[PDB]
């Protein structure tokens, strides 16, 4: 449910 940038970016 969370985003992607949260791990793919920051």
Give a topology summary.
Layout: H1 5-8
Describe the structure.
With 10 residues, this protein is an all-alpha fold. The protein has 1 helix and no strands. It has one helix at 5-8. The protein is elongated, with a radius of gyration of 6 Å. The relative contact order is 0.37.
Compact description:
With 10 residues, the protein is mostly helical.
Assembly form of the protein: monomer
Tell me about the largest β-sheet: none
Whole-angstrom Rg: 6 Å
In DSSP terms (H or I, runs of 4 or more residues), the helix count works out at 1
What global shape is seen?
Answer: elongated
Q: Which class best fits the helix and strand makeup?
A: mainly alpha
Strand content: under 5%
Q: Separation of termini?
A: 17 Å
**Proportion of helical residues:** 40-55%
Helix and strand element order: H
Beta strands, count: 0
PDB class: hormone
Keywords: Neuropeptide, Feeding regulation, hormone
Assembly: monomeric
Entry title: NMR structure of Neuromedin C in 40% TFE
Name some characteristics of this structure:
monomer, 10 residues, Neuromedin-C
């Amino acid at each position: 449910g969370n985003h992607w940038a949260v791990g793919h970016l920051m």
